[PDB]
């Protein structure tokens, strides 16, 4: 094969050892070309991790090690840490394509990190948005693990699904996750209720925050 | 330190062309070749081509020969990628990377931060930015207030947000961008540390949208309605 293939996903618990396979073929690994590995942490550029099958650039932890054969290569990660989560790409050169080739990438997930309940902050419409005849409620949700929540909105005590837009969660710099939910209202709707609420469900608990049109009056 | 710094995000119509730059510093520019690599959403890394920074010789991938040109300006320690006949599949982050020799091959040892090229027919629009606050501008108890900025009505992605207290950058919480039903985007940035009292203008959120060559700063949270 003139293409490198990787499992889309690998996972392990803190402290465990995983390996990421990169299968190639006779025109790349089998033609004598080395493999290199790149690490791409969330929202960052790729970084060289292993070069020449098994060499580490300065600064890369020796928990990362590589091996290579003519049919595949293997990146081993010992002592998994939450900071290792990201995408890993292999790279080689292919004679039949006359060019550099990359694997499709493997997403590494570190499961079983310590649970962390979400921090929820609810924001009412700004005075400036209301002057533009618009009203958005913003529910910001931070510092939770595992990275899965569900969000529900209420007007007074009635569930509201119209006008709701919720992001899917994304990992923060401290290995916890963040998400947001927006409720788009008209100024009439905002003013016609006693309060609005954002309810965040995570691992067997729900936390609710409430805002009221005349709170800072 | 070896560093590659690329130009900012670009938006183009289908059929147009885009020129992205990559400025090198921290080493002798002409001693190392530069490669260009792209990453579309939902696709792997893809090699675009190579340029020798000394003599200007190029090699391109068969997928792009005929509509890509690489060039270099040694006086500016810069290489350029010009990609023409743009299509929707060309929406991608374009990286430059330095080629480094070792005993039995070459590797890509240093990468630029990437430049997002969006191919779109939709009009480009700078964000509206609203100061939002959890709690009251002047709290009635001694419990803290949280500042954030609501960033809405912009196209395409993405924005970059920084917070300042005076001249000093402050910790922030970043949140995903979401596409609204009206096809524009919105996002929020939160000042991480809760506040009790501050001088008007002491804190500000700075929102950059390079696709519209714009920067907006909000430094006033006025009294609530
Ligand atoms: Na190096």
Residue numbers in the entry:
A (entry chain L): 1 to 217
B (entry chain H): 1 to 225
What's in the article?
Here we report four crystal structures of the human IgD Fab that provide the first high resolution views of IgD. Membrane-bound IgD, as part of the B-cell receptor for antigen, appears to play a role in B-cell anergy in the periphery. Secreted IgD not only recognizes commensal bacteria that reside in the upper respiratory tract, but can bind to and activate basophils. The Fab structures also reveal that the IgD upper hinge adopts a unique conformation among the human isotypes, which may play a role in determining its overall structure.
We solved four crystal structures of a human anti-Phl p 7 IgD Fab: Fab1 (2.75Å resolution) solved in space group P 1 with two Fab molecules (Fab1A and Fab1B) in the asymmetric unit, Fab2 and Fab3 (1.55Å and 1.45Å resolution, respectively), solved in space group P 21 with one molecule each in the asymmetric unit, and Fab4 (2.1Å resolution) solved in space group P 21 21 21 with one molecule in the asymmetric unit. Structural diversity in the Cδ1 domain is seen in the AB (residues 133-146) and EF (residues 193-202) loop regions, particularly around Arg137 (AB loop) and Trp198 (EF loop). In Fab2 and Fab4, Trp198 packs against Leu147 and Leu195, the plane of the Arg137 guanidinium group is parallel to the plane of the Trp198 indole group, and the Arg137 side chain forms a hydrogen bond with the Trp198 main chain. The position of Trp198 in Fab1B and Fab3 would clash with the position of Arg137 observed in Fab2 and Fab4. Part of the AB loop is also disordered in Fab1A, Fab1B and Fab3; although the AB loop is ordered in Fab2 and Fab4, the structure of the loop differs between these two Fab molecules. In the EF loop, the most significant difference between the five Fab molecules, apart from the conformational change involving Trp198, is the position adopted by Arg199. In Fab2, Fab3 and Fab4, the Arg199 side chain extends away from the Cδ1 domain. In Fab1B and Fab3, the Arg137 side chain forms a hydrogen bond with the Trp221 main chain; this interaction is absent in Fab1A, Fab2 and Fab4 as Arg137 either adopts a different conformation or is partially disordered.
